[PDB]
Structure 1
Amino acid sequence: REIVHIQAGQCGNQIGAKFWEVISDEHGIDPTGSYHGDSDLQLERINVYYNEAAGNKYVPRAILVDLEPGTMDSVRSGPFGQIFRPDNFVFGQSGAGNNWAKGHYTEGAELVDSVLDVVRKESESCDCLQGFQLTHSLGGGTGSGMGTLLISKIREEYPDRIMNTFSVVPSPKVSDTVVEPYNATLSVHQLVENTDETYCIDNEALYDICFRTLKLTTPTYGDLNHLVSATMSGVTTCLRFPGQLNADLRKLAVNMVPFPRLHFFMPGFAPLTSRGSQQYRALTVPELTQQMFDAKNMMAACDPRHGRYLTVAAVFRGRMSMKEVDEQMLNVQNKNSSYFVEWIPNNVKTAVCDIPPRGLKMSATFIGNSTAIQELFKRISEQFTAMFRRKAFLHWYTGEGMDEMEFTEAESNMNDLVSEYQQYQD
């Protein structure tokens, strides 16, 4: 099987560097080097993310889409930056304006064809394609607009292969941009209707989880990114490993989406202990479920405790008892019968790889489909209206060839999306 990553925008891009920083080491691939793999198993399934050309050069099969040179020229001028074949860099030296409209209708719409071109060169690579990974932020141009287009096109070209989306939904407390809800509401819209698996991460849900669950005092972006990339590795790549009970994107999809919206999840990693001290090793297993299922530790902003779950997928990856795994999951399902929805006898989807995260003994990625994420699109949707009402920075959109009915559309859509999700919380 296979997949083809997609680094839309700067963020989605910045993260690319971290997702590939990791994944590679979790596959023994040095900058341009080959497979130094401490083992021999980190190779029989690599294909999922690379391509065979030389014999020591397995190149990441991702796409780097962005209308701001400097960015990709920071990712390509640093560490692992020199492993992507230049063909991968689909830049847009234009003005990468922070407008969803500027990267979806006017500026991005041009650079698109020169992207799809490659997304096809990579898809028609070899063997059988599974789906595409998509990273980006719903709070900017090259991210929400142009990346949200990249998919609307992808999903027309292969409505068969899957589409996981890793979105950095606009954090609450403080917005790292101003129109944010504009660029956001507009991209979520496109998401709820193309990709079929979305993993929403919040820069501040991370800080928290990174400053209190990792006594880490100076959580640089690199970190946040790093933590995130840690989860997306547990998801995909991982399951493309052996296991007593293994799954793969689809299983994950076909066990997690009760209703076609596409629904968004909230990823959570397992061993998340501070370096030295904490290295408690309390990782027998009840310790991992202890972790994963708590409020804090959910990369999302919202707290599960604020709304039932529809599905859950503990994708563990480290030798354990299909008994102490299958078992724990249960008590968990009974101690919290309250929030776990009922019309699904077994919400949880236990998954079990074998080999764990390179240096760790036992981990377990968590992919939750809780109704709690209602209280986020609400947020976003609110911010919109409060500012849409006055058409705040709307001239930067319309003036870029947009529509007063376009914004209406998205909000509503994504706004209805909130509605539905409640239809199950009850």
Structure 2
Amino acid sequence: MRECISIHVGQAGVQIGNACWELYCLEHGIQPDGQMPSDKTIGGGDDSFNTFFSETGAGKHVPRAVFVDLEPTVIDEVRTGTYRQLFHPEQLITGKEDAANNYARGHYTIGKEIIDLVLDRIRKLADQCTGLQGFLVFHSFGGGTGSGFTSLLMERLSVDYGKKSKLEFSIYPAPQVSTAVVEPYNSILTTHTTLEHSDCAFMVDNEAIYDICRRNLDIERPTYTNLNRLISQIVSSITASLRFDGALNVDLTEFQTNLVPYPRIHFPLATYAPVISAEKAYHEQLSVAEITNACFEPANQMVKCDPRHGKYMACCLLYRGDVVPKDVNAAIATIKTKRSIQFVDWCPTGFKVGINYQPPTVVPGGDLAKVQRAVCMLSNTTAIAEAWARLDHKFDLMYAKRAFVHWYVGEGMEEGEFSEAREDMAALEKDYEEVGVDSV
């Protein structure tokens, strides 16, 4: 058991979902029609991949997932795409009108018309679970749906499923692939509303991913497809412990124990390596020490910030592929005596390590080179608050003039909600400052 239900909200959530589930299928040897020849228990099973896939009597392995968007055209591509057989039609939910880059429309005007339906379809998945562990929610901060509808859904899920764990994969906005000028507004509103309802949230800075695609894969102008294939690899690394077994396999919930010292401090910084092109990876083996050292290069982070100017409250290393503890310990010992790694005084300094022997996988015609070993570092750093600071500043510039606020007020929102949301962010920035101060 220990099933996990994924929820993909809005364009970003859906399109990232496409990349993730395609990648999952290739890692588990699942065909586009859902058949899995290596799986001998037909119609069911308690294997590790069953945490993410249910099984029909016809031998089809179906994602424990719901795709939701208030506009049909993005999910319509899933309905007619390569993996259309993978999903039951009821898992793919669409409206007729998007939220138009407006949190208010996603949370209230348009979202309220479909929220009951979404919950019913989620319930149908949950009732198929013998031991539901929690939910994984994929969405953007900037979109009207990814922002507005997600926060509504998260609130409703806390009511219907109590304290059942809810994890986030949140797309942090970037100017290079921006879709609206009010994305800072939507970002602050969602973070505020969702904060009490999320147990752990993995932010993905689009500018960080944009930079990595340009720098490491030599993609002159990355597309959403370029970004998503990289993101899915990070997502895969994090969910790998849930989808595979192994002696040195450490469950994500154990890392989570170390990563969240206080309920509001639940935003880990992800760093992934190696991101390298086929041209460069040829006749070039990146060792355990090399990819581990790459985790402390800020250029490889999922979020733009400087941990070297912050303090650590946890450090987790999630390896996959040809990796043994001996080489990990040696690599860590080297790194500790050469890097700017400083912990807060109220937390132990030991790195938590997990290893999944299942080697990394790449999607056909992709840009990422296929390597024998990869690593995803999850660290709790005060430096991630820099991401909040940049967003909150852009929020302040516009809100001081109440620019674009009328689009929200017109949908029933009040200025009090804006100020309430901003104050919560101010307290959150203060929280990250406080946890970094030395004990008395």
- In structure 2, do the counterparts of structure 1 residues 95 and 258 end up closer, same or farther at CA, with 3 Å as the change threshold? closer
Q: For structure 1, which runs of at least 5 residues remain unmatched after alignment?
A: none
| Structure 1 counterpart SS, 2:398 | helix
Give the corresponding residue for 2:129: 126
d(CA) in 1 for partners of 2:231 and 2:62? Answer: 22
Task: Please say if 1:421 is aligned against 2:432.
Answer: yes
Against the structure 1 CA distance between its residues 95 and 300, is the aligned structure 2 distance closer, same or farther, given a 3 Å change threshold? closer
Give the superposition deviation at 1:344: 1.9
The question of whether the paired residues in 2 share the 8 Å contact of 1:296 and 1:303 is answered with: no
Match of 2:209 in 1: 206
Report what 2:233 is aligned to. Answer: 230
CA distance in 2, matches of 1:19, 1:298: 19
Per the alignment, residue 139 of structure 1 pairs with 142
Local SS of the residue matching 1:401: coil
Which residue type is aligned with residue 128 of structure 2?
S
TM-score (norm 1): 0.93
Q: Deviations over 1:309-339 (max 9, x none)?
A: 2112111122422122134224433433553
Q: Secondary structure at the match of 2:204?
A: coil
Q: Is structure 2 residue 188 aligned with structure 1 residue 177?
A: no
Q: Deviations over 1:227-277 (max 9, x none)?
A: 001111111134432233322231121111111115212222222121123
Decide whether aligned partners of structure 1 residues 394 and 37 sit closer, same or farther in structure 2, where only a CA change above 3 A counts.
farther
Question: What root-mean-square deviation, in Å, do the aligned CA atoms of Structure 1 and Structure 2 show?
Answer: 2.3
Write the mapping of 1:14-163 to structure 2, written as runs, cut at 5 A: 14-36=15-37, 44-163=47-166
- Could you tell me whether the CA contact under 8 Å between 1:192 and 1:261 is conserved in 2? yes
Work out the CA distance in 2 between the residues paired with 1:154 and 1:315: 29
| In 1: Cα distance, 2:164 partner to 2:250 partner | 16
Given the alignment, which residue of 288, 296, 306 partners 1:285?
A: 288
Q: 1:367 aligns with which of 378, 389, 396?
A: 378
Alpha carbons of structure 1 residues 416 and 128: separation in structure 2 relative to 1, 3 Å: same
Equivalent residue letter for 1:12: G
Q: Counterpart of 1:368 in structure 2: which amino acid?
A: S
Looking at structure 1, the residues matched to 283 and 308 of structure 2 have their Cα atoms a distance apart, in angstroms, of 26
Q: Residue 68 of structure 2 aligns to a residue in which SS?
A: strand
Partner secondary structure for residue 63 of structure 2: coil
In structure 2, the CA distance between the partners of 1:306 and 1:79, relative to structure 1 (3 Å rule), is farther
Closer, same or farther: CA 280–308 of 1 in aligned 2, 3 Å: farther
Which residue of 379, 387, 393 maps to 2:404?
393
> Aligned to 1:381, which of 392, 395, 399?
392
CA contact (8 A) 2:141 2:183 kept: yes
Give, in angstroms, the shift of residue 157 of structure 1: 2.5
Question: Does the 8 Å contact 1:49/1:61 carry over to 2?
Answer: yes
Q: More displaced, 113-122 or 340-349? A: 340-349
Shift in Å at residue 225 of structure 1?
0.5
Give 1:356's aligned residue.
359
Instruction: Name 2:336's counterpart in structure 1.
Output: 333
Which residue number corresponds to residue 12 of structure 1? 13
Using the alignment, how far apart are the partners of 1:255 and 1:243 within structure 2? 21
Other-structure match for 2:366: none
- In the alignment, the residues of structure 2 paired with residue 38 and residue 317 of structure 1 have an alpha-carbon distance, to the nearest angstrom, of 22
Query: 1:12–1:143: 8 Å Cα contact kept in structure 2?
Result: yes
Deviations 1:394-423 (A, max 9, x none): 111111111111111111112211111112
Report the Cα distance in structure 1 between the residues aligned to 2:80 and 2:150, rounded to whole angstroms: 23
CA distance in 2, matches of 1:274, 1:37: 31
For 1:55 and 1:279, how far apart are their aligned partners in 2? 42
Deviates more, 1:97-106 or 1:240-249: 240-249
Deviation at 1:187, TM superposition (A): 0.7
- Counterpart code for 2:413: M
Going from structure 1 to structure 2, the CA distance change for 1:303 and 1:176 (only over 3 Å counts) comes to farther
Q: Residue 38 and residue 268 in structure 1: after superposition, are their counterparts in 2 closer, same or farther (change >3 A)? A: farther
Residue identity in the other structure for 2:15:
Q
Q: 1:37 to 1:267 in 2, by over 3 A?
A: farther
Structure 2 unaligned residues grouped into runs of 5+: 362-369
Contact 1:99-1:183 at 8 Å conserved across structures:
yes
Residue type matched to 1:90 in 2?
I
User: Shift of the alpha carbon at 1:54?
Assistant: 3.2
* 1:35/1:43 contact within 8 Å kept: no
SS at match of 2:281: coil
Gap change, CA 1:411 and 1:166, over 3 Å in 2 = same
SS in 2 for 1:263: coil
The structural deviation recorded for 1:53 is 1.3
Taking a change above 3 Å as real, the CA distance of residues 58 and 388 of structure 1, as seen in their structure-2 partners, is: same
Q: CA contact under 8 A between 1:309 and 1:347: conserved in structure 2?
A: no
- Tell me if the contact between 1:4 and 1:131 (Cα under 8 Å) persists in the aligned partners: yes
Report the residue type matching 1:31 in the other structure. Answer: P
> How far 1:130 moved relative to its partner?
1.4
Cα deviations by residue, 1:57-76 (Å, 9 ceiling, x for unpaired) = 11111111111111111232
Question: Pick from 306, 318, 321: which aligns with 1:303?
Answer: 306
Contact 2:298–2:304 at 8 Å: present in 1 too?
A: no
Q: How far has the Cα of 1:39 moved from its partner?
A: 12
- How many angstroms apart in 1 are the aligned matches of 2:37 and 2:296? 35
